[PDB]
Amino acid sequence: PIKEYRREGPRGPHLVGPSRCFVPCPVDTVQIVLPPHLERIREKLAENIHELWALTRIEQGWTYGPVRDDNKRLHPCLVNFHSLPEPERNYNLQMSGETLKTLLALGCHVGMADEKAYMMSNGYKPAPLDLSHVRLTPAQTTLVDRLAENGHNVWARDRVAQRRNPRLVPYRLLDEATKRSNRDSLCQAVRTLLGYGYNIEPRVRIFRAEKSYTVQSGRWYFEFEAVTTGEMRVGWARPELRPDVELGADELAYVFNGHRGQRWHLGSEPFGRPWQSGDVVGCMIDLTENTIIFTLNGEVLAFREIEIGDGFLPVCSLGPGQVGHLNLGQDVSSLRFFAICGLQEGFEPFAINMQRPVTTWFSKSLPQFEPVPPEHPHYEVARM
Amino acid sequence: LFAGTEHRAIMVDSMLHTVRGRSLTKAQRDVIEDCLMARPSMLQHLLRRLVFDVPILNKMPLKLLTNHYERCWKYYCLPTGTSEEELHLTRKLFWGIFDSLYDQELYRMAMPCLCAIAGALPPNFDPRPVETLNVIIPEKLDSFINKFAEYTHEKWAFDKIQNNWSYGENVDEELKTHPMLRPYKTFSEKDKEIYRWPIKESLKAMIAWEWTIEKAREGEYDPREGYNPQPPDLSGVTLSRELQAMAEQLAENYHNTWGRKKKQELEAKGGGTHPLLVPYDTLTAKEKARDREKAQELLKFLQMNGYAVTRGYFLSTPAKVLGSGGHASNKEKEMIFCKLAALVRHRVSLFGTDAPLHILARSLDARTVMKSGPEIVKAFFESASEDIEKMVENLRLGKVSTTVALLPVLTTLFQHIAQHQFLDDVQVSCYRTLCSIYSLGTTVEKLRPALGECLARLAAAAFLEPQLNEYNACSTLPMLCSYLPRWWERGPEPALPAGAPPPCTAVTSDHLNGNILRIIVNNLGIDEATWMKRLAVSRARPELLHSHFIPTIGKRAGKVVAEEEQLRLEAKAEAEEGELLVRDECRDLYALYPLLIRYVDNNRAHWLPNANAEELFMVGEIFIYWSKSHNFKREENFVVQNEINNMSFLMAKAGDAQSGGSDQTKKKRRGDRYSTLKKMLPIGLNMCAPKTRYALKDVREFLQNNLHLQGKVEGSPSLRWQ
Helix, strand or coil: CCCCCEECCCCCCEECCCCCCCCCCCCCCCCCCCCHHHHHHHHHHHHHHHHHHHHHHHCCCCEECCCCCCCCCEEHHHCCCCCCCCCCCHHHHHHHHHHHHHHHHCCCCCCCCCCCCCCCCCCCCCCCCCHHHCCCCHHHHHHHHHHHHHHHHHHHHHHHHCCCCCCCCCCCCCCHHHHHHHHHHHHHHHHHHHHCCCCCCCCCCEEEECHHHCECCCCECCEEEECCCCCCEEEEECCCCCCCCCCCCCCCEEEEECCCCCCECCCCCCCCCCCCCCCCCCCEEECCCCEEECECCCCECCEECCCCCCCEEEEEECCCCCCEEEECCCCCCCCHHHHCCCCCCCCECHHHHCCCCCCEEECCCCCCCCCCCCCCCCCCCCCC | CHHHHHHHHHHHHHHHHCCCHHHHHHHHHHHHHHHHHCCHHHHHHHHHHHHHHHHHHCCHHHHHHHHHHHHHHHHHHHHHCCHHHHHHHHHHHHHHHHHCCCHHHHHHHHHHHHHHHHHHCCCCCCCCCCCCCCCCCCHHHHHHHHHHHHHHHHHHHHHHHCCCCEECCCCECCCCEECCCCCCCCCCHHHHHHHHHHHHHHHHHHHHCCCCCCCCCCCCCCCCCCCCCCCCCHHHCCCCHHHHHHHHHHHHHHHHHHHHHHHHHHHCCCCCCCCCCCCHHHCCHHHHHHHHHHHHHHHHHHHHCCCCCCCCCCCHHHHHHHHHHHHHHHHHHHCCCHHHHHHHHHHHHHHHHHCCCCCHHHHHHHHHHHHHHHHHHHCCCHHHHHHHHHHHHHHHHHHCCCHHHHHHHHHHHHHHHHHCCCCHHHHHHHHHHHHHHHHHHCCCCCHHHHHHHHHHHHHCCCCHHHHHHHHHHCCCHHHHHHHHHHHHHHCCCCCHHHHCHHHHHHHHHHCCCCCHHHHHHHHHHHHHHHHHHCCCCCCHHHHHHHHHHHHHHCCHHHHHHHHHHHHHHHHHHHHHHHHHHHCCCCCHHHHHHHHHHHHHHHHHHHCCCHHHHHHHCCCHHHHHHHHHHHHHHHCCCHHHHHHHHHHHCCCHHHHHHHHHHHHCCHHHHHHHHCCCHHHHHHHHHHHCCCCHHHHHCCCCCCHHHHHHHHHHHHHHHHHHCC
């Protein structure tokens, strides 16, 4: 149902929004240089890469011969790397030089940090070394995935002359099973370089309960289940708040953030825990004892010694993709969050007060005209 | 804000005059308090001119003003966590202060707070122009100087064309014409030198400083009357930060060449002084720009002609490398004055941990080198305890993010075997090693296995200090062979042996990451062991920390004994409460028992099963009353005073919350709609303001349960004093 700000769920109406929304455009790599002293490493890496490619084919049952046919398992490139002319050899050479050029593009310190250093097959079974013996750094693996992304996007750029093939999509958006090949060759080049000892160093929805329903007296408590982890921020805030300002960035708001736990009251203030998905926030505003206690599935963790300037309102705010189930009363809908720390402290669910479902408001992304107030960031008008 | 900066620079000038004694010191206290009172950024601009003054600070009075200003930079450090680079220069000045060697050490502590400001960054004048005329420029540049001087004519003319100036034989500023406005080709070479002179003197300054100037890359509003320049876009040329530094220092040359002459210009005359006769670092970039635009545009034209141009946050990490050199300098001191400055730097080392990628391991290697310079002292002296505090910070150094350092741990582990023959300060490093291990709990291996040889020396043997280290060091078929025997140790329930065995339970708790239920039984056994052991000294309090780890290892059936233990603590308390009543016509020992119950609250935290407690509707409510009965003893009075004695050697509401549920299961939901018996139970609380007589005013299912809320209301009355 397009964009949306709500969708129904088994526990109740989960809140959503604002969602998120291209054609491939790979960065140039050919302009990058991989100079002579490293060009020898280009030749060696091309040799070991062509060898590992030969293993990748032979494992599939490929066998050398004049024919290039796939079903017959016959292929010209299964001959010696030296024997291959720099075209047929370029398939494992130019890809390697472009690999290192892309490594330079990544800002890697891919110099000569270290000196460079089995089933029978039909006329060609060379062996190099045990490349897998050395563990890759995770950063190097992510960089390898960047190599797969850049090389595949470039392959799409070359294939752009030929609506569109399913393979002709950006690497970020294509299915992960398609990744499991370019990532494999990337792991091959990575185990080759590391095996040679080459180091590589590299619009927010707000939900407000209705102003008529604003609390101003007594103790109160609402809940917010969260279908998905992320930039959640749930708390109490004064009715006169302006939505255009990010929530929690001002004195008017008192909210606890989703990830990191950095609850806000005008600026950052870390506390609590980064809860896992499905955990209940369950905010507990307290008047007389002017504080706002917070919980995580009945696990108490906040803001203290406030004042009632015009009462308070039940407030929530979602991230770009985050989704959660705001909760407001109905003892049947009450679960782990209220059965424990709720009644014992005497705090009241809103449907104790009410029968009608509580309507709220939210800030549409849509710009609209609005008369300029005399107080503002002083874009002052002057009739004359 | 600029007026405030001016007044601040003026008061700073007064402090420089002070750098009438005590009164002027009061004026320095005035500038100090003024700095403390305060936009903060413009205040930091006045503190930027005062940062240049800080460069002038290193004099003792100036050091004191710099110290109070450093405290202002500590308040700035609080507020903040461009000018940050100047703060880095102030850090270099602090290292210079380290090179300078009482109160000065405290000033260095202020420079340690300034070092914390650097960590936030990581998150009369005496001009000395270099001689120029003595230096001889190579003559290959003359073709360039022709083009750039002709360009100077082009700019000086184009600026005139902006006001429509033109050639005219008579001088007149109002006629919009001037005689000098004639083509540069018409000028004699000597007249061309009028334009070339600042240029050639500038290049002579570049050669006197031996800055590179060599051939390389290739180099090439209505129209008005008279000569009509349309000057090449030198301003669009982009200098790098190095080239920006070079242009900034040529602007410094114009600030010195003219700056030295301007002094003498007013010396021979007997005249006063000029505003520009101030240190270059003090200058605002705009005052610098008057010469900088002349300086950059020269380098931009050199780059336009392709001449090579060189002098011929991340820095804070490089500053740590300088500290590593100081760590090497400390090793020179370790060979045994200069060491005392390093002892002064130890305070900064404590600040360095509060300050907090792969390069940081080199600093951790320096922290390992710091251990090398400390280990000799292990085998004034309070600095070693500060180094022991740094040893706590050494764990933070590992938390911040070679192989020989791991070998050093095997050496210190060997020292534990020497202890078996029969010092403690060397064992304090093991407490730091435990802190290093607690840091490792968040995250070669044979060197870690070398510690098992120490563990063999640990199990074989005041000794609690070394034993506590094992609890953190614990972070396995080999361990499994003795792990089953640990259950046999639980069957022991000789008090001294418990202190070491308790760490072994924590060791299994660290290994707990089903199988935990067996460890839970080991924990329940520890609960069954501590339950009797606490009925009897201070060593149990050491177990209370391990009991917290045992709580992390954690069983509702075990609570049935814990309730009986809490009741036994309460039934004994009934005599202890009577012990005070007996004296009406001591309890300090009970505070130690309360500390045992403080562990029970940590065990209650393991039960916080409190989630499961709502589903019970069990006997816990009666057990909570025992704690509530203890609360009555806490506000009878003497037991609360007894806790202060326990506090010298150094909650209940969570239990009370479950007690409130006694008013109810499904009936409790009806109480929400009552805005069922919870409402009537509240009426009983009104009667608590004034035992069975209150219940009669309203029954075993009610009057008994009401007594719990009534006693809790009495505890609430105890909380009413707050």
